[PDB]
Amino acid sequence: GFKQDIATIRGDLRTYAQDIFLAFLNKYPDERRYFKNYVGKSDQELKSMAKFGDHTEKVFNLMMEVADRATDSVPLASDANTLVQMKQHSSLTTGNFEKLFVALVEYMRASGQSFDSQSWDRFGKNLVSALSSAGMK
Numbered sequence: 001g002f003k004q005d006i007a008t009i010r011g012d013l014r015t016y017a018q019d020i021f022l023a024f025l026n027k028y029p030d031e032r033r034y035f036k037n038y039v040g041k042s043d044q045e046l047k048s049m050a051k052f053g054d055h056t057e058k059v060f061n062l063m064m065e066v067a068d069r070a071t072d073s074v075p076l077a078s079d080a081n082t083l084v085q086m087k088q089h090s091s092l093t094t095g096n097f098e099k100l101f102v103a104l105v106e107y108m109r110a111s112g113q114s115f116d117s118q119s120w121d122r123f124g125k126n127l128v129s130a131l132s133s134a135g136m137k
């Protein structure tokens with residue numbers, strides 16, 4: 001289930017973080033614009049760039065912490081607030097997060113590894129709701 005999926009992702013955090021983030025950028029190329037230093041780089045080029053690995057690792061570590069603190073895939077109000085109030089997320093709207101979770105769910109469904117993809121879709125939905133309420137446009 002969802003708790004096991006957190007363990008699966010954490011077990012190989014850098015690999016999953018990189019592969020899911022790339023699936024996101026590749027499904028929604030307009031999103032790459034927000035990450036000026038990943039512009040003009042192939043998947044393998046990014047996998048060799050230390051800063052890409054560090055970014056994705058930090059993002060997915062935080063995502064997994066928010067997931068782990070959730071109850072029944074409903075994230076904490078404080079965690080949603082953290083994501084909204086982060087200076088790095090000042091320009092974002094909930095659609096940016098929607099796209100990340102659509103790509104993440106698509107990745108999980110296409111994977112040979114078992115995932116509770118339905119629960120991640122619902123987690124994403126619940127996170128988007130919590131982000132909106134916390135002030136995200």
Ligand code: HEM
Nearest residue numbers: 031034035054055058059060062063088089092096097100
């Ligand atoms: C639940 C989902 C998300 C989590 C947990 C998250 C988490 C984080 C974390 C921990 C950082 C700082 C990491 C570092 O030091 O590099 C960061 C930075 C950033 N995030 Fe997110 N993020 C999420 C979604 C998004 C989305 C959907 C976008 C836009 C499409 C976005 C845009 C950015 C940008 C532009 C930065 C700054 C990167 C830089 O320093 O160049 N984030 N995020």
Ligand SMILES: [C-]#N
Nearest residue numbers: 055056059060
């Ligand atoms: C940042 N994702």
